[PDB]
Specification:
The structure is a homodimer. The first copy, chain A, has about 140 residues and is mainly α. Chain A has one domain (about 1-140): Arc Repressor Mutant, subunit A (Orthogonal Bundle), CATH 1.10.10.10. Helix content of chain A is about 65%, strand content about 10%. Chain A has 6 helices and 2 strands, in the order ααααββαα. Chain A has helices at about 10-30, 35-50, 55-60, 65-75, 100-120, 125-135; strands at about 80-85, 90-95. Chain A has a two-stranded antiparallel ribbon. In chain A, β1 and β2 (about 90-95) form a beta hairpin. Bound molecules: 6-hydroxypyridine-3-carboxylic acid (2 copies). The PDB classes it as dna binding protein.
């Protein structure tokens, strides 16, 4: 088999690629204005309308705790709203604000630039392949 | 075009890396070793005596985090910190017998983890995923 080299394991490559992409995201959209987590939570609220914590988790693939923290940090900025479930008066329902939608629409071109710079020199087939495989790998 | 975060390469990278980290933690408990500690120990085993620059270049972890991991391991008597006699601003980290024993004990599980991370990819898809993740990091 040969010695074990972590440098050629799929996990090492995943970590390094994710770190590089996070550096690109932070260098293009300043971490001060919006984080990838906050940006994705707001985009989910925009795409699905009013969402509950379970909906935001299942759509955002972020654990309940980090989603709750992001929800607090964004509600403080009047970028999302917290209403009462029209079916469970003891549940939360998160909705998007005009300020939140305005921030999402302001940042979208930068996220597209981030996707393009992250791909780097990959040709179209290689881009489709990497997104296909990263999606296929994230399921049982 | 419309923006879907769900189909952007960053969301997919985050999801894949988080799933692989969950696998790594589900097979190798944090109590024994973290992925960072394991990778630094493997670097010490593969390269011998290393300085902070060598451990960084081999481990792909930022120098400050490498210092933190090295401290957390020297406290556990899994590596040793001897100062080079050819410099005073040079650190020299070496592997201990307990460190090499832990590395050799965990290597089969790290390989099992690499295998579990691959999931249902057929061999061609595996060649492709490692090819693309390596090609994308170089620009
Ligand atoms: O470089 C890393 O952090 C790494 C390397 C191998 C693995 O299985 N998981 C993580
Ligand atoms: O879900 C995330 O963290 C994410 C989503 C999109 C992007 O470009 N980068 C990171």
């Amino acid at each position: 088999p040969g010695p074990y080299h972590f440098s050629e394991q799929v996990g090492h490559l995943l970590r390094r690629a994710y770190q590089r992409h996070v550096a690109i995201f932070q260098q293009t959209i300043p971490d001060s204005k919006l984080t990838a987590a906050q940006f994705v939570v707001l985009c989910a609220l925009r795409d699905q309308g009013a969402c509950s914590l379970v909906d935001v988790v299942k759509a955002t693939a972020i654990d309940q705790a980090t989603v709750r923290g992001v929800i607090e940090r964004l509600k403080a900025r009047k970028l999302l709203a917290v209403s009462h479930d029209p079916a469970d008066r003891r549940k939360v329902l998160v909705t998007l604000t005009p300020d939140g939608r305005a921030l999402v629409e302001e940042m979208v071109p930068f996220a597209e630039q981030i996707t393009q710079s992250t791909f780097g020199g990959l040709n179209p087939a290689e881009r489709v392949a990497i997104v296909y495989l990263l999606r296929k790998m994230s399921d049982a």
